[PDB]
Amino acid sequence: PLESQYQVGPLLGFGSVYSGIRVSDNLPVAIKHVEKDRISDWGELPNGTRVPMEVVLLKKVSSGFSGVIRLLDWFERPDSFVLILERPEPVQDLFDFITERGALQEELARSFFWQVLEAVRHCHNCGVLHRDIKDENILIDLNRGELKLIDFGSGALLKDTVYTDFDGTRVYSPPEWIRYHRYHGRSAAVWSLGILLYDMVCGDIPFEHDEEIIGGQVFFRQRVSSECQHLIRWCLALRPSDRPTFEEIQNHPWMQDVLLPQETAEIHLH
């Protein structure tokens, strides 16, 4: 039973996520409700039970690596599924963090971006494509300086063939999706990481309209180092084959000498 195993609190944050505590060990959790009528892609568990694809993807990435949110449990109800998700405390998502702080110092953006890269690599290694990388979908564990990727509700199994469907965030989507309604998983992910990196070092995303997305011009509204500008422009290459691999991103000169998560918390979050 769900009502007997968790103490349910107030809403957090058209989504339905509640604060919670696991009665067993007083662990803080987030309790996410998903209506069956609104589920786009369905999947099957090893037991063959029909579950939301979100549950499938969350189970595939769940492990000791704390760069991705951990699905602690889930329940099925007549008209909905309920997901028990990890809740760090204290926490703030990266969108609110950038709103309150403005453009991030490059040392801090480097640490955050590096941790997002490791988390996305973990997803891909587990066969999972997130498809909605953005600052809203990144939680900051403020005391540990660790970032957590959340909300796989738009994700898919990773494949090497073309995708013709998309339900992530349009202003983070690549120009090949805007123009042709097709994309490949990894190069589309890299485009969204370019949007995210610009967002971190300039204080907001670069493109709001389709014509900006396909236009291929990146104006920098903030002082940004030449090295970081190069990485961003590389990630935002119009031709997908021109974009860097994850290895090329992490080997880029701007990415060297990253701070550890604990150093990040003490220098920038405490």
Partner: peptide, 8 residues
């Protein structure tokens, strides 16, 4: 300049 969230 207005900064905003963008639903999926």
């Amino acid at each position: 300049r207005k900064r905003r969230r963008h639903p999926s």
